[PDB]
Each structure stands twice: as C-alpha cells, then as structure tokens.
Subunit: 72 residues, 7 copies
C-alpha cells in the first residue's frame, strides 16, 4: 500500500496548500515533516476564511490541526 507520508517526502522543497481545522489554511513551501505529520513551511501565508492574515518566512504546524496537504 503506498504510504501517505512518502507523498509528503516526495513534496519536499515544493509549494503546497495545507488545510487546517477551523477554516484556517496555509500556503508555503514544505521543508520538513514528521510522524505526527507536524509540518514546517518556508515563505508561507496564513489564510483565514479565504483571506490572507499574515506572511512569515517560517512556520512549524502541529499535525493535530492538519486536515490535508496537497502540492500546489
């Protein structure tokens, strides 16, 4: 069964859209991840209900709030 985590691994260094719980979303470049699916994005923006609320050079996201991750 292909493993879901290997799909993040294949996405390293590329732009991705990350959907979090609560209508929050992140767009940035994936530079790291772990088992719990905690993520690290470089050059990213935080969207809150279709609206940009902040841009940061780096963010560490708790896997607990991740709904899905897909390469852009």
């Amino acid at each position: 069964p292909p493993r879901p985590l290997d799909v993040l691994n294949r996405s390293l260094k590329s732009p991705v859209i990350v959907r979090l719980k609560g209508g929050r979303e992140f767009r940035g470049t994936l530079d790291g991840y772990d088992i719990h699916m905690n993520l690290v994005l470089l050059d990213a923006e935080e969207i809150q209900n279709g609206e940009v609320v902040r841009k940061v050079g780096s963010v560490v996201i708790r896997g607990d709030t991740v709904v899905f991750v897909s390469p852009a």
Copy 2:
C-alpha cells in the same frame, strides 16, 4: 473481515471521502496506512456540494475522515 482490506481493493480506483465538517473529496485512491491517512490522485474538493478545487494529489489526515466509499 478487515476494513483496510477493502481500501486495498479500492487502490487505483475512484472513491468518495467524507471529512469532518461536511467537506468531501472524490479522487483515485493511491495509498493508506493503519491510521487511515489517505492519498488521492486527480481529486475534486467538494464543499456544500460544489467543486471548490481540483488537485492531482492530496494527503489526508486520518483523524479527519468519517468514511471512504468506492465510486458507484
């Protein structure tokens, strides 16, 4: 009989994935693990019943899944 075995015979075949909140995904199943994290290819994100996006790859966190059903 085991549930994951069902996901197995659904590999490289169309499925419907309902998530918490009402969000839905229709795509080709490419992978899964024991926690039921999933990977879909050529999928359509569907909110409220309308195609809100079209991604060719998505990793979905198990915690968010309510159910997975093969395509009619």
Copy 3:
C-alpha cells in the same frame, strides 16, 4: 463478553451506525477491526430520518462512531 465480540455476532446482518454529528448508516456489517472501523455493504446514509446517499459499500472510521446495533 467483550464489545468486539458482540460485533462479530452481527456480521452478515443489517445494523444501524450512529456517527458524531448525528448522521447514520444502515447496512450489512461485513467487517471491522480493533479500532472499531467498520465496513457496510449496501448502505444508506441517513440525516434527519431521510436517505441522502446510497453506496455499494463503505468504510467508517472507528473514531467517528457513536454506536452500532443490529437493525
């Protein structure tokens, strides 16, 4: 008697599965695991006491389950 054993007794028989939120599934119990994930053949999703979806089969994540009982 243990919970998982009462499930086994329900195989090949119709069951009602309530989920968090309030939705339900009516179908034939074809399988399950320790996590309480389940498989239903010829099932219907039910919201407010009315059918909203018919599926040849479904895998339901144990985590979303509230209860399972024979129909």
Copy 4:
C-alpha cells in the same frame, strides 16, 4: 476501589449510560473494556424523554460515554 470493578458487579443488571449530546441508553450491561466501550442488551435509546428506538444489543464507543449508573 476500582471504577471498572463497579462496572463488573453491574453486569446483567440494568444501567443508564449517558452519552455526549444529552443522549442516553437504558439497558442491561453485558460487557465493557479498558477504554470503557460498552455492550448493552435490550436497551432503550432516549433523547429528551422520548424513545428513538429499541435494540436487542448495542455497542457503544467509550469516547462518547459521559457516565454509567445503575437504575435498579
């Protein structure tokens, strides 16, 4: 004294099991485990007094359980 031991001596006895969302179940306690998943026989599903349905048996997920109490 152990909470699960109280459950043990209540086997085959009638009990009320309250779930989250104000839902309750009235039946005979037939089984349970560490996580507090329960098995009730000849149980009445109650919602604000009125009976939703009655079942020969029901498997209830520990997660949705608020409490259990006799009801002689």
Copy 5:
C-alpha cells in the same frame, strides 16, 4: 507530588467533579483509576444552581472530567 495521590486523600469524602459542557457532579468519592475514571456514591448532577439528577452511584469517564475537588 502526583495528582492521583491527592485524589486518594479524598476516598470516602465528598468531592466536586466539573465535567466538560459545564455540568457538575457532587458526591462521595468511592474510587478511581489512572484514566481518571471516578466512582461516586449518593450523588447529584448539577446544572446552573439546581440539582437536575440523583443517582445512588455513578462511574464517570475520566475523559469528560475537567477537575475534581473536595467539598468547598
């Protein structure tokens, strides 16, 4: 030192148990375990200054508990 130990100090003495949702249980602490499940005897369920239910004994799932304290 350890939280449960201070809970042991209360065996056979009345306590207050605040549940998730805002409800409370007042009763005699007869037992408990590591999951923090509780056993209360001759207890009352409380909702906004009023006793909404009486039970001769009740087993509460640790999961739904916010805190436990001796009588005020």
Copy 6:
C-alpha cells in the same frame, strides 16, 4: 533544550495561573503534576468569565483541559 516540565518544577509550592479550555481559569499554589500536565493546586480558586465562582482547598485538573501555566 530546556524542558517545559522542569520550568514547571521550579514553580512547585509557588502561586501559578492556570488557563483551561473555554475561558475557565484557576489561581492557586502549584503542588504537583505529571508528564501529561495533570495538575494539583492547593488553596486555589476557579474563575469563569472574569469572575470568581468557587474556592477549593485542593483541586486536581485534567491535563487535556490545560492551555498554559504561568507564575502569578
């Protein structure tokens, strides 16, 4: 890397402020804790919506409800 739990230890027998899920709060003296952050406070007080609601001699707080702990 300094460890959160050790900083928490340096606060034993000292007044702390504990924020719980849902705006609830506790102000009391830190007496114990475990790895999951289950806590024990002596001479504490509950606070809801900005107002005191009760005073307890001791209270055990479930870790999963805690948001943060800080010296008063």
Copy 7:
C-alpha cells in the same frame, strides 16, 4: 529538517505562538519538548489584537498549539 529542528534554531529568539481558540502568545522561546509543549519568556497573551496579559514566563501545553513561527 523536521519540526523540532526548526524550534531549536529559535531558542533565545522571539516567536509567535497561535493557540486553538484564538489566543496568541508572543515571546522569547526558552524551551520545548517532543510533545511540543513550550516555554516562553517575557510574553504577551494577545486576543483580538489587544494585549491581555504580560508574563515573565509561561508554559503552554503542546496539544493547544496550532503553529509556532519565528518573528
């Protein structure tokens, strides 16, 4: 460069910490563990864009954190 590696690079540096429920903390990152529990120094609790508390030190349960960002 997993998650925890990024957090280490931020020790003794100021960070933004978003919590579930709207609350936000801003301060120097003094510590962390695998559970992602955090220790901040000279931090402000922010809610609705207004400082609602100034603390010399705060320990945050990892399960309550949404994300951590170097500021």
